[PDB]
């Protein structure tokens, strides 16, 4: 018979299987649509989620009942040292999809990227790309021919980049390597851009800009095996329940004589690849200066890094991006920032954002001060201060 009272199903059927991601780094599933008129440009960047913080900004929403007033927003700060492009691969369109034709790497490969290629790096001969550089290490030995192959074929061109895990405060020492599509100019222009940018850094201030909606691709925080109540949000069974109440009572009817795929079951929670869209860049800042967290109103010389550093992460002395809201994945995790797949106005994507003040108080407790100078001024002299 029918349910006595109707109710929406628990959970989303388009996000299963709720299994662990194939890798810690979440790849961009779909790159933005190619346009040949626009100049060759990276469609993505690789950053490291540093943490979260608070900003104050004047809301400019012409028509809201509370417009032109200060608002407090939560932002995510990601540490984005300039990604080193080395290598470029080509993709020919076939009745079977995009097929990789060839990949051409550069002369010098970084120790971090070779560590990425290795597993037991310390007990190894470090023999990687040696004969590749021997094929290379000339002016026109054999790499220009592969370049010509990618020009004559390979309707899609994807550059290969790796992160600066040494520049970031992580204890990883192993670079993250990914592909970024070039969505400008002809195939010849894409290959020329890739070759000129071979073996060098690309900056996120050049990739993205302020007041832009982007997509964060990341693997969510892992939570291990989980029951139905927190995995899917099902009801808790009453107090007087034999052999357990954190369970789904009925897992199926008599017929079909099988547990159905749509029934909520206990299993792995978290550590899923996710692509969140429409995240507004609130700031693209650099660490080659102080006053990163300083605005035109606060004008107090301070970096983005809170007092005592970002909790569990450290310092952001590199280039960084603060986007609005939350993004998938926890701190110390590699995230992929992709350009938006569509152009929407919505009176929310074109809204120019001018920050007033960025919360730099300690996140390691109920921090009261934003700078050590302010803390010292408030507290006066202490016993430890001579």
């Amino acid at each position: 018979s029918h349910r006595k009272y109707e109710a929406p199903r628990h959970g989303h059927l388009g996000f299963l299987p709720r299994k662990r991601a194939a890798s810690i780094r979440a790849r961009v599933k779909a790159f933005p649509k190619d346009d040949r008129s626009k100049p060759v440009a990276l469609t993505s960047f690789l950053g490291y989620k540093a943490g979260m913080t608070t900003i104050v900004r004047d809301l400019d929403r012409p028509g809201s009942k509370f417009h032109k007033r200060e608002v407090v927003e939560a932002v995510t700060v990601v540490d984005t040292p300039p990604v080193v492009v080395v290598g470029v691969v080509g993709y020919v369109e076939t009745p079977r999809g995009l097929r990789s034709l060839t990949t051409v790497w550069a002369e010098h490969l970084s120790d971090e990227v070779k560590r990425r290629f290795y597993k037991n790096w310390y007990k190894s001969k470090k023999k990687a790309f040696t004969k590749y550089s021997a094929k290379y290490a000339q002016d026109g030995a054999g790499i220009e021919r592969e370049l010509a192959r990618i020009k004559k074929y390979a309707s899609v061109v994807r550059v290969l980049v790796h992160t600066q895990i040494r520049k970031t405060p992580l204890a990883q020492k192993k670079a993250h390597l990914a592909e970024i599509q070039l969505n400008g100019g002809s195939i010849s222009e894409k290959v020329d851009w890739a070759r000129e940018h071979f073996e060098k850094t690309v900056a996120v201030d050049s990739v993205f800009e302020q007041n832009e909606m982007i997509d964060a691709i990341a693997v969510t925080k892992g939570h291990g095996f989980e029951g139905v109540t927190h995995r899917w949000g099902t009801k808790k069974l009453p107090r007087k329940t034999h052999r357990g109440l954190r369970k789904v009572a009925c897992i199926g009817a008599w017929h079909p004589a099988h547990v159905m795929w749509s029934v909520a079951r206990a299993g792995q929670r978290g550590y899923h690849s996710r692509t969140s869209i429409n995240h507004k860049i609130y700031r693209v800042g650099k660490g080659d200066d102080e006053a990163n967290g300083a605005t035109s109103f606060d004008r107090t010389k301070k970096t983005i890094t809170p007092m005592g550093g970002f909790v569990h992460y450290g310092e952001i002395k590199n280039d960084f991006i603060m986007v609005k809201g939350c993004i998938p994945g926890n701190r110390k995790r590699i995230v992929t920032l992709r350009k938006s797949l569509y152009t929407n106005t919505s009176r929310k994507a074109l809204e120019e954002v001018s920050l007033k003040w960025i919360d730099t108080a300690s996140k390691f407790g109920k921090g009261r001060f934003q700078t050590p100078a302010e803390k010292h001024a408030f507290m006066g002299t202490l016993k430890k201060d001579l």
């Binding site: 109707e6 109710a7 929406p8 608070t54 009942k65 007033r69 200060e70 608002v71 407090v72």
Partner: protein
Amino acid sequence: SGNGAQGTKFRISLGLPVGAIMNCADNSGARNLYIIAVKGSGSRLNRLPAASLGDMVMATVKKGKPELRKKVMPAIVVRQAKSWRRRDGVFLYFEDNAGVIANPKGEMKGSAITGPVGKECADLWPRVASNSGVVV
């Protein structure tokens, strides 16, 4: 409530589900208002309709002069006592939950407010603001 609701309100954290008794902040002769339903509430199984600050609810007088008792009247919540977050990030709360009797349009039966009134409720209902002394 339609014609009487002057504008929209941002999401205020719900703190008064059905069955809650709040103080009566006007001089209509009622002492407490018991919430039986909330206008504009959604439909989810097992979920109680919950009132927030500035919300219009259906209420009954459980303590007060007998003319208001044993019948249903519209009411407006003026104090929540459950912390809610404003746009400027401030989490504020009151000492008690309190509301005022009113007609379906929004006109109060009383002529004065005893105590403070939330800014959201005052902005939603001008007459409540007019009869309110302190608006926070």
